[PDB]
Amino acid sequence: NLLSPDRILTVAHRGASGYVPEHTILSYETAQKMKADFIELDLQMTKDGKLIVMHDEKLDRTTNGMGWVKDHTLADIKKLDAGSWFNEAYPEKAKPQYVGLKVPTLEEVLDRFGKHANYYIETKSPDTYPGMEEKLIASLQKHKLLGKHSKPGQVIIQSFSKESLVKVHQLQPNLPTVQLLEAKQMASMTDAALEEIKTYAVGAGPDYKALNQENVRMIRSHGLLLHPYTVNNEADMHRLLDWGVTGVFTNYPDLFHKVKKGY
Ligand SMILES: O=P(O)(O)OC[C@H](O)CO
Ligand SMILES: [Ca+2]
Ligand code: NA
């Protein structure tokens, strides 16, 4: 069971993004081959209302385009190069085949992997994107990833926005959510706050730098899954697993897969 506290989950942060440009089909394919349990998506929305996968609200960092995603049509965004930026930023990891990779839609990612992947999907800035949760759920429903014979945990919805997750939970009670937390939030965490999270979410996803043995124990004592982000070096993977987290977001899913076998 994907949602079992006894199972350690490898969540490939924006795919195998330590090796391949984030949020490209190729990044997700690479994560799959590296035995990731989940491929992780960040959602934005185009001017014509299409959900696409991109971390930033703006095109500037990971494409040769400029401006807010929501000011551009999907057709115009599909003209962009979403791979070359990676070759430039990380020359030592550059590959010729990264040139010309495209921004995928949510629909394209679900179409690519179907039920062969598990999806960890974040609603970014959902208050700025009317209808984001409904469109997301509609896409999941039509790709047969929802329903009550669906595999529990095949999709997890995550967000920094509590509002977004409460909305998802109200619309789809059996769709597991995970509340994301910044270091500043996690540092002042209370039992009351965790009990509140537990009413709509099955787990918490904090900045791992805010974690210690005591508050890992605290989170787990509430029966919450615990998936800290973003864990990229092996020593920290060991430390967190030793403390008792139940998975991580990582840019190096192959490395975490190896580490977790010892726990
Ligand atoms: O990488 P960010 O900025 O989306 O941070 C949150 C983690 O990815 C967990 O979704
Ligand atoms: Ca994310
Ligand atoms: Na750019």
Side-chain angles (χ1 to χ4, degrees):
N1 174 26
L2 286 167
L3 299 180
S4 172
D6 295 323
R7 182 156 173 190
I8 305 172
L9 298 176
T10 304
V11 185
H13 184 240
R14 319 187 189 165
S17 64
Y19 307 109
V20 188
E22 63 179 72
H23 292 320
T24 57
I25 294 299
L26 183 58
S27 184
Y28 301 139
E29 291 170 334
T30 301
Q32 287 286 95
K33 298 180 184 305
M34 290 177 175
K35 302 182 213 172
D37 294 296
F38 285 79
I39 52 174
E40 195 254 351
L41 286 56
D42 298 311
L43 300 182
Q44 307 293 339
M45 187 185 291
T46 68
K47 183 176 179 185
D48 49 340
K50 313 304 174 193
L51 292 175
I52 58 130
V53 187
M54 180 170 290
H55 175 270
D56 301 348
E57 288 70 23
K58 293 189 202 166
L59 295 165
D60 300 63
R61 183 177 57 94
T62 62
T63 74
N64 57 337
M66 307 179 191
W68 287 70
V69 173
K70 72 190 309 189
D71 287 327
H72 291 81
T73 62
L74 176 59
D76 276 344
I77 293 170
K78 280 299 194 176
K79 299 179 185 167
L80 303 180
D81 183 339
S84 288
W85 70 273
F86 177 101
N87 286 353
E88 176 57 42
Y90 310 108
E92 44 292 354
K93 285 176 175 180
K95 296 189 194 299
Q97 70 256 37
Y98 294 165
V99 174
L101 292 174
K102 297 298 192 175
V103 180
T105 64
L106 172 59
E107 276 291 325
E108 287 167 337
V109 179
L110 302 177
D111 196 45
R112 171 68 185 92
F113 299 104
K115 304 192 86 160
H116 301 287
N118 305 308
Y119 309 85
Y120 213 125
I121 306 175
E122 187 175 343
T123 49
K124 290 291 189 187
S125 300
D127 65 287
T128 86
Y129 289 130
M132 171 167 274
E133 292 81 9
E134 287 92 344
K135 288 174 177 177
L136 168 54
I137 290 176
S139 283
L140 294 173
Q141 279 179 330
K142 297 304 301 182
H143 283 275
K144 320 147 213 176
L145 299 170
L146 292 181
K148 297 140 257 158
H149 268 82
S150 63
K151 184 177 66 170
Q154 178 131 43
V155 183
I156 294 171
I157 303 303
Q158 47 159 353
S159 191
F160 285 97
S161 172
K162 175 184 172 197
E163 297 73 15
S164 183
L165 298 187
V166 171
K167 185 182 174 187
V168 167
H169 182 63
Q170 292 180 326
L171 292 172
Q172 294 288 321
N174 267 289
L175 187 47
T177 74
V178 165
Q179 176 69 61
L180 302 178
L181 300 165
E182 312 170 24
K184 176 164 168 206
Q185 294 170 304
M186 183 63 226
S188 59
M189 189 54 57
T190 59
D191 278 328
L194 289 171
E195 254 210 344
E196 182 170 15
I197 288 168
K198 177 69 169 177
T199 68
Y200 58 89
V202 304
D207 184 336
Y208 82 94
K209 274 150 291 168
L211 292 181
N212 50 52
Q213 173 65 98
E214 293 83 357
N215 60 24
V216 165
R217 182 185 305 117
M218 178 184 192
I219 291 173
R220 294 287 295 107
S221 73
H222 285 268
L224 290 163
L225 301 176
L226 178 48
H227 299 160
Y229 68 86
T230 295
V231 187
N232 294 327
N233 59 83
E234 180 171 352
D236 290 336
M237 299 173 174
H238 284 278
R239 177 51 63 90
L240 292 166
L241 287 176
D242 190 24
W243 282 343
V245 308
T246 66
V248 304
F249 300 83
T250 181
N251 296 345
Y252 301 91
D254 55 340
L255 174 59
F256 188 68
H257 181 80
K258 180 199 68 178
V259 169
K260 82 180 194 174
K261 299 175 177 303
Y263 299 86

PDB file of all heavy atoms in Angstrom, residues 59-66 81 85, ligand 3:
ATOM      1  N   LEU A  59       7.757  31.994 -17.074  1.00  0.00           N
ATOM      2  CA  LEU A  59       8.445  31.141 -18.052  1.00  0.00           C
ATOM      3  C   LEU A  59       9.961  31.313 -18.046  1.00  0.00           C
ATOM      4  O   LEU A  59      10.690  30.476 -18.578  1.00  0.00           O
ATOM      5  CB  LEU A  59       7.919  31.445 -19.456  1.00  0.00           C
ATOM      6  CG  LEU A  59       6.460  31.130 -19.768  1.00  0.00           C
ATOM      7  CD1 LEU A  59       6.059  31.841 -21.055  1.00  0.00           C
ATOM      8  CD2 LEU A  59       6.264  29.624 -19.907  1.00  0.00           C
ATOM      9  N   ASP A  60      10.433  32.390 -17.427  1.00  0.00           N
ATOM     10  CA  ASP A  60      11.783  32.876 -17.680  1.00  0.00           C
ATOM     11  C   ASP A  60      12.915  31.912 -17.327  1.00  0.00           C
ATOM     12  O   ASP A  60      13.875  31.801 -18.082  1.00  0.00           O
ATOM     13  CB  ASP A  60      11.994  34.191 -16.938  1.00  0.00           C
ATOM     14  CG  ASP A  60      11.025  35.265 -17.388  1.00  0.00           C
ATOM     15  OD1 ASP A  60       9.806  35.080 -17.192  1.00  0.00           O
ATOM     16  OD2 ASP A  60      11.476  36.285 -17.946  1.00  0.00           O
ATOM     17  N   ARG A  61      12.814  31.222 -16.196  1.00  0.00           N
ATOM     18  CA  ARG A  61      13.941  30.417 -15.718  1.00  0.00           C
ATOM     19  C   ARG A  61      14.183  29.162 -16.568  1.00  0.00           C
ATOM     20  O   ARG A  61      15.325  28.870 -16.933  1.00  0.00           O
ATOM     21  CB  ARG A  61      13.741  30.016 -14.254  1.00  0.00           C
ATOM     22  CG  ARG A  61      14.919  29.233 -13.679  1.00  0.00           C
ATOM     23  CD  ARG A  61      14.726  28.900 -12.206  1.00  0.00           C
ATOM     24  NE  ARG A  61      13.499  28.148 -11.973  1.00  0.00           N
ATOM     25  CZ  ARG A  61      13.438  26.819 -11.913  1.00  0.00           C
ATOM     26  NH1 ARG A  61      14.546  26.094 -12.033  1.00  0.00           N
ATOM     27  NH2 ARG A  61      12.275  26.215 -11.701  1.00  0.00           N
ATOM     28  N   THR A  62      13.123  28.428 -16.892  1.00  0.00           N
ATOM     29  CA  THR A  62      13.296  27.117 -17.519  1.00  0.00           C
ATOM     30  C   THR A  62      12.906  27.066 -18.991  1.00  0.00           C
ATOM     31  O   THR A  62      12.830  25.975 -19.569  1.00  0.00           O
ATOM     32  CB  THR A  62      12.485  26.028 -16.789  1.00  0.00           C
ATOM     33  OG1 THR A  62      11.089  26.342 -16.871  1.00  0.00           O
ATOM     34  CG2 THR A  62      12.898  25.927 -15.313  1.00  0.00           C
ATOM     35  N   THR A  63      12.630  28.218 -19.595  1.00  0.00           N
ATOM     36  CA  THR A  63      12.378  28.271 -21.039  1.00  0.00           C
ATOM     37  C   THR A  63      13.067  29.467 -21.667  1.00  0.00           C
ATOM     38  O   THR A  63      13.633  30.306 -20.969  1.00  0.00           O
ATOM     39  CB  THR A  63      10.866  28.351 -21.396  1.00  0.00           C
ATOM     40  OG1 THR A  63      10.366  29.665 -21.119  1.00  0.00           O
ATOM     41  CG2 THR A  63      10.056  27.323 -20.631  1.00  0.00           C
ATOM     42  N   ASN A  64      13.002  29.552 -22.992  1.00  0.00           N
ATOM     43  CA  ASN A  64      13.470  30.738 -23.696  1.00  0.00           C
ATOM     44  C   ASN A  64      12.342  31.751 -23.904  1.00  0.00           C
ATOM     45  O   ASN A  64      12.438  32.627 -24.751  1.00  0.00           O
ATOM     46  CB  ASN A  64      14.107  30.357 -25.041  1.00  0.00           C
ATOM     47  CG  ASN A  64      13.165  29.585 -25.950  1.00  0.00           C
ATOM     48  OD1 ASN A  64      12.205  28.964 -25.496  1.00  0.00           O
ATOM     49  ND2 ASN A  64      13.454  29.600 -27.248  1.00  0.00           N
ATOM     50  N   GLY A  65      11.276  31.623 -23.118  1.00  0.00           N
ATOM     51  CA  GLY A  65      10.188  32.586 -23.133  1.00  0.00           C
ATOM     52  C   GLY A  65      10.278  33.518 -21.938  1.00  0.00           C
ATOM     53  O   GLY A  65      11.101  33.306 -21.046  1.00  0.00           O
ATOM     54  N   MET A  66       9.434  34.547 -21.918  1.00  0.00           N
ATOM     55  CA  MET A  66       9.414  35.513 -20.820  1.00  0.00           C
ATOM     56  C   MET A  66       7.992  35.792 -20.375  1.00  0.00           C
ATOM     57  O   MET A  66       7.080  35.860 -21.198  1.00  0.00           O
ATOM     58  CB  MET A  66      10.058  36.838 -21.231  1.00  0.00           C
ATOM     59  CG  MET A  66      11.446  36.758 -21.823  1.00  0.00           C
ATOM     60  SD  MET A  66      12.002  38.424 -22.247  1.00  0.00           S
ATOM     61  CE  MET A  66      13.465  38.075 -23.216  1.00  0.00           C
ATOM     62  N   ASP A  81      11.610  26.326 -25.897  1.00  0.00           N
ATOM     63  CA  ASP A  81      12.628  25.339 -25.548  1.00  0.00           C
ATOM     64  C   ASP A  81      12.715  25.242 -24.032  1.00  0.00           C
ATOM     65  O   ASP A  81      13.109  26.202 -23.375  1.00  0.00           O
ATOM     66  CB  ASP A  81      13.979  25.755 -26.149  1.00  0.00           C
ATOM     67  CG  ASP A  81      15.093  24.741 -25.904  1.00  0.00           C
ATOM     68  OD1 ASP A  81      15.004  23.918 -24.971  1.00  0.00           O
ATOM     69  OD2 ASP A  81      16.084  24.785 -26.653  1.00  0.00           O
ATOM     70  N   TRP A  85      18.113  25.596 -21.128  1.00  0.00           N
ATOM     71  CA  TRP A  85      18.478  26.318 -19.908  1.00  0.00           C
ATOM     72  C   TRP A  85      19.313  25.444 -18.977  1.00  0.00           C
ATOM     73  O   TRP A  85      20.192  25.937 -18.264  1.00  0.00           O
ATOM     74  CB  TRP A  85      17.225  26.793 -19.170  1.00  0.00           C
ATOM     75  CG  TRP A  85      16.484  25.647 -18.563  1.00  0.00           C
ATOM     76  CD1 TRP A  85      15.535  24.865 -19.170  1.00  0.00           C
ATOM     77  CD2 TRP A  85      16.673  25.101 -17.251  1.00  0.00           C
ATOM     78  NE1 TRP A  85      15.108  23.891 -18.307  1.00  0.00           N
ATOM     79  CE2 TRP A  85      15.791  24.009 -17.124  1.00  0.00           C
ATOM     80  CE3 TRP A  85      17.498  25.433 -16.172  1.00  0.00           C
ATOM     81  CZ2 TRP A  85      15.708  23.250 -15.957  1.00  0.00           C
ATOM     82  CZ3 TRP A  85      17.412  24.683 -15.012  1.00  0.00           C
ATOM     83  CH2 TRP A  85      16.518  23.604 -14.915  1.00  0.00           C
TER      84      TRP A  85
HETATM   85 NA    NA B   3      15.002  31.999 -20.112  1.00  0.00          NA
END
